[PDB]
Design an enzyme around this catalytic site. Structure first.
Site, mmCIF file in Angstrom:
data_model
loop_
_atom_site.group_PDB
_atom_site.id
_atom_site.type_symbol
_atom_site.label_atom_id
_atom_site.label_comp_id
_atom_site.label_asym_id
_atom_site.label_seq_id
_atom_site.Cartn_x
_atom_site.Cartn_y
_atom_site.Cartn_z
ATOM 1 N N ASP B 43 13.088 -6.661 4.191
ATOM 2 C CA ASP B 43 13.075 -6.434 2.445
ATOM 3 C C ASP B 43 13.159 -5.058 2.409
ATOM 4 O O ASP B 43 13.681 -4.183 3.225
ATOM 5 C CB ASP B 43 11.652 -6.975 2.126
ATOM 6 C CG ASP B 43 10.646 -6.608 3.223
ATOM 7 O OD1 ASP B 43 10.670 -6.074 4.324
ATOM 8 O OD2 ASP B 43 9.340 -7.231 3.003
HETATM 9 C C1 LIG Z 1 -3.084 7.478 7.778
HETATM 10 C C2 LIG Z 1 -3.754 6.657 6.677
HETATM 11 C C3 LIG Z 1 -3.266 5.740 5.858
HETATM 12 C C4 LIG Z 1 -3.780 5.434 4.668
HETATM 13 C C5 LIG Z 1 -2.831 4.414 3.634
HETATM 14 C C6 LIG Z 1 -3.065 4.687 2.125
HETATM 15 C C7 LIG Z 1 -2.572 3.472 1.323
HETATM 16 C C8 LIG Z 1 -2.039 3.999 -0.060
HETATM 17 C C9 LIG Z 1 -1.761 2.967 -0.977
HETATM 18 C C10 LIG Z 1 -0.804 3.401 -2.263
HETATM 19 C C11 LIG Z 1 -1.158 2.517 -3.632
HETATM 20 C C12 LIG Z 1 -0.502 1.255 -3.380
HETATM 21 O O1 LIG Z 1 -0.659 0.335 -2.697
HETATM 22 S S1 LIG Z 1 0.653 0.917 -4.671
HETATM 23 C C13 LIG Z 1 1.002 -0.862 -5.187
HETATM 24 C C14 LIG Z 1 2.208 -1.460 -4.713
HETATM 25 N N1 LIG Z 1 2.796 -2.215 -5.855
HETATM 26 C C15 LIG Z 1 3.423 -3.443 -5.760
HETATM 27 O O2 LIG Z 1 3.983 -3.582 -4.755
HETATM 28 C C16 LIG Z 1 4.044 -4.297 -6.907
HETATM 29 C C17 LIG Z 1 5.366 -5.045 -6.808
HETATM 30 N N2 LIG Z 1 5.748 -5.387 -5.279
HETATM 31 C C18 LIG Z 1 6.716 -5.815 -4.892
HETATM 32 O O3 LIG Z 1 7.910 -5.594 -5.605
HETATM 33 C C19 LIG Z 1 7.175 -6.215 -3.448
HETATM 34 O O4 LIG Z 1 5.848 -6.735 -3.048
HETATM 35 C C20 LIG Z 1 7.431 -4.919 -2.662
HETATM 36 C C21 LIG Z 1 7.291 -5.440 -1.214
HETATM 37 C C22 LIG Z 1 6.441 -3.844 -2.956
HETATM 38 C C23 LIG Z 1 8.832 -4.400 -2.839
HETATM 39 O O5 LIG Z 1 9.676 -5.128 -2.031
HETATM 40 P P1 LIG Z 1 11.431 -4.736 -2.005
HETATM 41 O O6 LIG Z 1 11.602 -3.617 -3.094
HETATM 42 O O7 LIG Z 1 11.973 -4.190 -0.627
HETATM 43 O O8 LIG Z 1 12.020 -6.007 -2.887
#
Ligand SMILES: CCCCCCCCCCCC(=O)SCCNC(=O)CCNC(=O)[C@H](O)C(C)(C)COP(=O)(O)O
Ligand code: SF4
Ligand code: SF4
Lengths: 208, 88, 115, 112, 379, 176
Positions: B43
């Site tokens: 993906d």
């Molecule tokens: C070392 C310690 C590490 C700590 C980690 C901290 C984590 C930080 C988190 C950041 C905040 C979030 O999650 S931001 C939340 C992200 N938002 C979304 O994912 C909405 C839409 N999702 C999609 O479109 C697909 O699932 C996607 C696979 C994403 C796209 O795949 P492709 O485009 O390929 O097709």
């Protein structure tokens, strides 16, 4: 009205009502309602898009010039479609008066930041984002100000539990402070203090 | 050997090598004309991961506006060839 | 109708682009954080954790929710850059000290009344 | 002439009458572009005309300060500048238009 | 231009230095955030009263007075005159405690440290007055939304008079050690200068306004209790630096002594809480002899009094500036919302502006002159 | 009315300029501060000799809690649960049931001294003067557990302090 009843002032009430009508006349595009309380406190309910204009007016008009921003806060009422209610309190030193401006918003709708109008709003706005989750657009730097780093959720919402979801302790196996799911030795006793036999008929609501 | 111009062959070798470096792609399936979506099962996140790896080896920042269209190694090598301004 | 005010993205493409940029930033920053905070984990584990936290919110289909999550992730990344956190804040993502809760019916039946 | 007006960052203005007259004339000129029926235009025109008439009919400063009911004439010039800036911003905003939209059914209903 | 984190009242400060000068100074707060505003919603008004002592623990009766005024305004009742005079007398005494603490702590941070003990002796005497009236040295809970909890002990006014006729010499000794000292002047003069317009826009209040030349005081412009019945002067600065604010605090101490003398001389007789048993609990003898008194005592100490629905913002002139409470009541016996406005929040927000182009050692002086207590800042 | 604190213009004549120069060069104000400190050295200190001397208190002082009882010997508590309901910190836990003779009495009365805020609401909400906040304040502990008082500990405190507790109550009950 014996000495156990708070005295009522009518001149201030009339002045505040007149100024509320004056303000609502000047800005009919944004103001939705004007109210004067029984204890001489004037409040103005406006549209969310009028935060920057109306405030600016109240800060710059020769007849208003509400120079100081005393307080800025939010109120959560989950029963409303527009969940959060933003409250601005302004103090005018030239006319020795106070005003209140109220606005509505929800979780996803942003509200334009008023840092340009009042600098004092800056931290206040951050506080709102820390406690309620209301996003303020065009803010110099919007981030948590009160909660711990990495804290998940906004504590001041009505659906947030009082004790939170996690608690901190010290673990010797990993030699550091760790967070665990919260477990209380004694559960917070909930009291049903509210009683039947309504006390204030003046606030009675229609039986729909 | 000292500093010969970047041939369209050496660029392909380096791109293929850093593609084999990926742990999620096995050497016995990918080709120069392979597609990331259905011939390899990735993906968008692996795509950006692959793109980032290419940037590190190559040394030039790739903007996101045009890194989404590098969908197979072919157009990848074409993109570095165009950016480095090398002809044949 | 159902017309709403945007935050940063007009449609899903811009939100996906912002998610991609945030992922690029986190992927680039993971090894620096691992070295600077003197973590016991490897860079591979940190990148895997970043991937897991990104894929946790993969079912969101609202651009406003997506870019609000992007704003939160950017804020957290900024928090991580300036060493505003400590080792404990970073390591709270792994739950190394919590016992592993079971999933099947029989184990949950044995431990207690929790469904 | 007085010195050290008392407010930090506020300088003493020599010949405040000319500055006040210029500022009020500019305020009126900016107000001239607002539509006639707008309440802002008539209210601010009335206020500015009153202030200009009072400043043109008094050559003194202390008596003018007492009459203007603002005090410390320099901050009166400051408020004139603020009013001019607000007038320009308001001409940009156009708030004399009707309401943007009504709030929801029970948006302002308290309690609950 | 290196970045450094002065880590762990207690404060975290991330600042960038270009050599000796300070480029940017960002204070991180939340280290004393306990969530008072959320815990208040789960308590009745009487149960929520003691939180305000913990709010600003250097000025406690002032917070009690602010909360009591807000609840009285919502309840549409007023306290008896004697209760108001006690409130005012105690408020002035508390102001002295706050100003002593602020000035002595600022000097100790600079490095004087002798006036700290010299004036903490008097602070100990003031604790005794707090203790005699309510049984607590610091967390008093004396002032209630109906007036005060209990009447004064029969030997309190004489002791207050005896103490307050020797305090002027203590203030004079403090001024002798600090006011004309060249080291203190070099440490404070022309430090953290704030203009009147910036102070107004940045939300400052109290001495921070009065130090910049602004003639504003909530006890004069908007008197609440018996203030319009006492005469006192309002010190006003001329430069907006730390020295002017220090002088303003000393003069405020002297005017507080003046108001204390006036309150002692003009004490009226009468009751100490509103004669409304549906708001203020009745006396113990009445409770143990009368049926209505027993019922009202039971209901007040179990359920509480219902406040009519409405929202108010009540602000008073606390020793640190304008201290306000925005109280929203839904008609029940528990407040729906209690937002607390503390001047320390705005002052610490403006710290970054006020510490532009100053040495590293000047930040400590500016923080001291802001009169920052983090209990009210974090809430 | 308002005063000016820093609105003094120094004199610019020769005598005042010379006086200021002499102050700068000879450090007169520093010597004045030194003299003030020296004068403060030669007076009696305010220190008391703890623990042989104790600081003054009043009958209204709030300290360690206690449970009193009637002169006949029966405990005053009747399990009305007003103190539990009025406690701001929820530090009081009460469980009750009819006694052997049918009297309304408690089976459990716990006060968590690490949760209590010593506000005195419990002793003023009590209609029979059962729970009182005693005058003892020197009851520190080496472990957390011993600060979780139960009914036996509070009754022991009442029996231990009843003399001065009753004296203070007699001295102060006319103000309540
Ligand atoms: C070392 C310690 C590490 C700590 C980690 C901290 C984590 C930080 C988190 C950041 C905040 C979030 O999650 S931001 C939340 C992200 N938002 C979304 O994912 C909405 C839409 N999702 C999609 O479109 C697909 O699932 C996607 C696979 C994403 C796209 O795949 P492709 O485009 O390929 O097709
Ligand atoms: S003093 Fe206050 S906090 Fe302590 S037990 Fe009594 S009511 Fe509860
Ligand atoms: S208020 Fe007094 S009588 Fe009632 S339960 Fe508490 S201690 Fe017992």
């Amino acid at each position: 009205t014996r000495p156990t009843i708070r005295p009522r002032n009518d001149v201030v009430h009339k002045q505040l009502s007149a100024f509320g009508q004056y303000v609502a006349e000047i800005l009919p595009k944004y103001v939705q309602q004007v109210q004067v309380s029984c204890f001489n406190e004037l409040e103005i309910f406006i549209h969310p898009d009028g935060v920057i204009p109306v405030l600016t007016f109240l800060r710059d008009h020769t007849n208003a010039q509400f120079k100081s921003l005393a307080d800025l806060t939010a109120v959560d009422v989950p029963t409303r479609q527009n969940r959060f209610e933003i409250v601005y309190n302004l103090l005018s030193l030239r006319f020795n008066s106070r005003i209140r401006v109220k606005t509505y918003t929800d979780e996803l709708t942003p509200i334009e930041s008023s840092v340009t109008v009042y600098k004092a709003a800056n931290w206040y706005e951050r506080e709102i984002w820390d406690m309620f989750g209301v996003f303020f657009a065009n803010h110099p730097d919007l981030r948590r100000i009160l909660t711990d780093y990495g804290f998940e959720g906004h504590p001041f919402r009505k659906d947030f539990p009082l004790s939170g979801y996690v608690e901190l302790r010290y673990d010797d196996e990993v030699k550091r402070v760790v967070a665990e799911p919260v477990e209380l030795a004694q559960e917070f006793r909930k009291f049903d203090l509210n009683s039947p036999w309504e006390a204030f008929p003046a606030y009675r609501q229609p039986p729909e | 050997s000292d500093a010969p111009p970047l041939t369209l062959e050496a660029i392909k070798d380096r791109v293929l090598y850093v593609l084999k470096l990926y742990d999620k792609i096995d050497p016995e399936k990918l080709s120069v004309n392979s597609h990331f979506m259905k011939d390899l099962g990735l993906d968008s996140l692996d795509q950006v991961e692959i793109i980032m790896a290419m940037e590190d080896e190559f040394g030039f920042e790739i903007p996101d506006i045009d890194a989404e269209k590098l969908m197979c190694p072919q157009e990848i090598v074409d993109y570095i060839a165009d950016k480095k301004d090398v002809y044949e | 109708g159902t017309s709403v005010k945007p935050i940063f993205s007009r449609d899903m493409n811009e939100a996906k682009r912002r998610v991609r940029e945030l992922y690029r930033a986190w992927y680039r920053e993971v090894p620096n954080t691992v070295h600077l905070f003197q973590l016991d984990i490897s860079v591979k584990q940190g990148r895997d954790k970043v991937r897991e936290m990104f894929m946790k919110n993969a079912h969101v289909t609202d651009p406003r929710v997506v870019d609000l999550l992007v704003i939160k992730g950017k804020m957290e990344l900024e928090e991580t850059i300036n060493v505003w956190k400590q080792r404990t804040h970073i390591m709270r993502f792994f739950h190394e000290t919590e016992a592993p809760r079971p999933t099947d019916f029989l184990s949950k039946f044995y431990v207690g009344h929790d469904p | 002439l007085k010195k050290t007006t008392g407010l930090v960052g506020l300088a003493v203005c020599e010949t405040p009458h000319e500055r006040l007259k210029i500022l009020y004339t500019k305020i009126l000129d900016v107000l001239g572009q607002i539509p006639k029926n707008a309440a802002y235009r008539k209210y601010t025109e009335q206020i500015t005309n009153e202030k200009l008439g009072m400043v043109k009919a008094e050559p003194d400063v202390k008596k003018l300060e007492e009459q203007l009911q603002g005090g410390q004439i320099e901050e009166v010039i400051l408020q004139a500048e603020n009013e001019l800036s607000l007038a320009r911003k308001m001409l940009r905003w156009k708030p004399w238009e009707p309401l943007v939209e009504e709030p929801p059914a029970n948006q302002w209903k308290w309690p609950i | 231009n290196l970045t450094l984190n002065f880590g762990p009242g207690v404060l975290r400060l991330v600042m960038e230095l270009s050599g000796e000068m300070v480029r940017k100074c960002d204070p991180h707060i939340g280290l004393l955030h306990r969530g008072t505003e959320k815990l208040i919603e789960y308590k009745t008004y009487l149960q929520a009263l003691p939180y305000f002592d913990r709010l600003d623990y250097v000025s406690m009766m002032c917070n009690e007075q602010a909360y009591s005024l807000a609840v009285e305004k919502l309840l549409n009742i007023q306290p008896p005159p004697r209760a108001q005079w006690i409130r005012v007398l105690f408020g002035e005494i508390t102001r002295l405690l706050n100003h002593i603490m602020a000035v002595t702590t600022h000097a100790l941070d600079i490095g004087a440290m002798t006036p700290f003990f010299w004036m903490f002796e008097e602070r100990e005497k003031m604790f005794e007055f707090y203790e005699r009236v309510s049984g607590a040295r610091m967390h008093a809970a004396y002032i209630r939304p109906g007036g005060v909890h209990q009447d004064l002990p029969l030997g309190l006014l004489d002791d207050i008079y005896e103490f307050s006729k020797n305090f002027s010499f203590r203030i004079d000794e403090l001024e002798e050690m600090l006011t004309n000292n060249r080291i203190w002047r070099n440490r404070t003069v022309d430090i953290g200068v704030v203009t009147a317009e910036d102070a107004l826009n940045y939300g400052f209040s109290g001495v921070m306004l009065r130090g910049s030349g602004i003639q504003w005081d909530l006890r004069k412009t908007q008197p609440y209790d018996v203030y319009d019945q006492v005469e006192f002067d309002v010190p006003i600065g001329s430069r907006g630096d730390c020295y002017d604010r220090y002088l303003c605090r000393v003069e405020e101490m002297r005017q507080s002594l003046r108001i204390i003398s006036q309150c002692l001389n003009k004490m009226p007789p009468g009751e100490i809480k509103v004669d409304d048993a549906k708001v203020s609990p009745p006396k113990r003898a009445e409770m143990k002899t009368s049926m209505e008194s027993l019922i009202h005592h039971f209901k007040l100490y179990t359920e509480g009094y219902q406040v009519p629905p409405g929202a108010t913002y009540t602000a008073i002139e606390a020793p640190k500036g304008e201290f306000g409470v925005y109280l929203v009541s839904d008609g029940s016996s528990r407040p729906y919302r209690c937002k607390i406005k503390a001047p320390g929040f705005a002052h610490l927000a403006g710290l970054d502006k006020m510490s532009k182009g100053h040495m590293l050692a000047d930040v400590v002086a500016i923080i001291g002159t802001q009169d920052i207590v983090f209990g009210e800042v974090d809430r | 009315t308002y005063k000016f604190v820093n609105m003094r213009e120094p004199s610019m004549d020769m005598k005042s300029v010379t006086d200021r120069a002499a102050q700068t060069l000879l450090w007169t104000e520093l010597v004045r501060g030194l003299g003030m400190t020296l004068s403060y050295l030669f007076r009696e200190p305010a220190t008391i000799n703890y623990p042989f001397e104790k600081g003054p208190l009043s009958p209204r002082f709030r300290g360690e809690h206690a449970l009193r009882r009637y002169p006949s010997g029966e405990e005053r508590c009747i399990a009305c649960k007003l103190c539990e309901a009025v406690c701001p910190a929820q530090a009081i836990t009460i469980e009750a049931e009819p006694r052997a003779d049918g009297s309304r009495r408690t089976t459990r009365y716990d006060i968590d001294m690490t949760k209590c805020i010593y506000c005195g609401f419990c002793q003023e909400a009590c209609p029979v003067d059962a729970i009182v906040e005693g005058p003892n304040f020197e009851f520190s502990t080496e472990t957390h557990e011993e600060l979780l008082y139960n009914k036996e500990k509070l009754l022991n405190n009442g029996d231990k302090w009843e003399a001065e507790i009753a004296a203070n109550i007699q001295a102060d009950y006319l103000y309540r």
